[PDB]
Design a protein around this ligand. Structure first.
Ligand SMILES: [Cl-]
Ligand SMILES: [Cl-]
Ligand SMILES: [Zn+2]
Ligand SMILES: [Zn+2]
Lengths: 150, 135
């Protein structure tokens, strides 16, 4: 009889009141002390328990964050690489960094920001960029980046 | 809201920078998480579609992990955002092993008829085709 595998067969994903964004906030600050701009989307998002942040999260903060869910007598979750409670994966509460252009968390790239898929939006950023107080060589480099989408 | 005349240019460059295998540690949004999922090859499988949208839409990870642990040989690159996956070689054999263990579990557990039905319902897999859809 496989006692550990049984845990996964009897397990049910948490509800809205369990393993929620509250634990994302808690583990984030815990993980930070073991080594942040906390924020409070016009489309459907699957996972709602992600604490959103306005700064980068180092590999150390992120690795410590995942270890906090470590739990013995459990199999290694092949998604996050942590032995954690079944159906309670820390990837669902990992804190996410927002893009200041759209206020949503996504990866850096050419076709990842929702705010750079419409020419009307790119122009609005070009006008805003003209009012920047940043060094000229950065405003120049950023202005070109916008034009490269047109 | 978060844009000001002191970070708008930096935000445009920071948010649009593309990934470079030659220089992978270049500061980029959620880089630590992107590298963690790249190492696990979750960006090249049945979730690659999602790596260009909101990270809160990558997948229902609570379920992806629950499925991945029920099928040790199921390639993780097969899991889909909702928990579905492309049937793997040892799929038919694992459902068999899962039922035996499940029944043995119910025996040792002092459950109630309504609760016994749920546990059996939780592990049902509808194989519509190339893809296997659980629950
Ligand atoms: Cl662990
Ligand atoms: Cl200027
Ligand atoms: Zn996990
Ligand atoms: Zn964005």
């Amino acid at each position: 009889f496989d006692s550990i595998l049984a845990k996964s067969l009897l397990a049910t994903t948490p509800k809205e009141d369990e393993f929620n964004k509250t634990l994302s906030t808690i583990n984030l600050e815990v993980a930070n002390k073991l080594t942040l701009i906390d924020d409070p989307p016009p489309y459907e998002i699957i996972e709602k328990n992600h604490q959103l942040v306005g700064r980068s999260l180092s590999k150390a903060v992120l690795d410590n964050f995942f270890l906090l869910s470590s739990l013995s007598d459990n199999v290694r979750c092949r998604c996050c690489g942590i032995k954690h409670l079944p159906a309670h994966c820390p990837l669902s509460i990992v804190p996410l960094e927002i893009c200041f252009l759209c206020g949503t968390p996504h990866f850096s790239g050419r076709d990842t920001c929702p705010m750079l898929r419409n020419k009307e939006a790119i122009y609005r950023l070009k006008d805003s960029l003209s009012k920047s107080r940043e060094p000229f060589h950065i405003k120049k480099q950023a202005m070109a980046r916008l034009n490269s989408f047109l | 809201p978060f844009l000001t005349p002191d970070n708008i240019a930096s935000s445009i460059l920071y948010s649009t920078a593309s990934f470079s295998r030659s220089k992978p540690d270049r500061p980029r949004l959620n880089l630590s998480l992107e590298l963690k999922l790249m190492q696990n090859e979750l960006n090249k499988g049945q979730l690659k579609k999602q790596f260009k949208g909101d990270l809160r839409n990558l997948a229902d990870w609570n379920n992806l992990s629950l499925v991945s642990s029920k099928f040790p040989s199921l390639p993780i690159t097969n899991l889909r955002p909702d928990g579905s996956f492309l049937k793997h070689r040892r799929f038919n054999e694992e459902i068999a092993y899962n039922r035996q263990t499940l029944e043995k579990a119910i025996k040792q557990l002092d459950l109630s008829p309504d609760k016994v039905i749920q546990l059996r319902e939780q592990n049902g897999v509808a194989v519509n085709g190339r893809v296997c859809y659980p629950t």
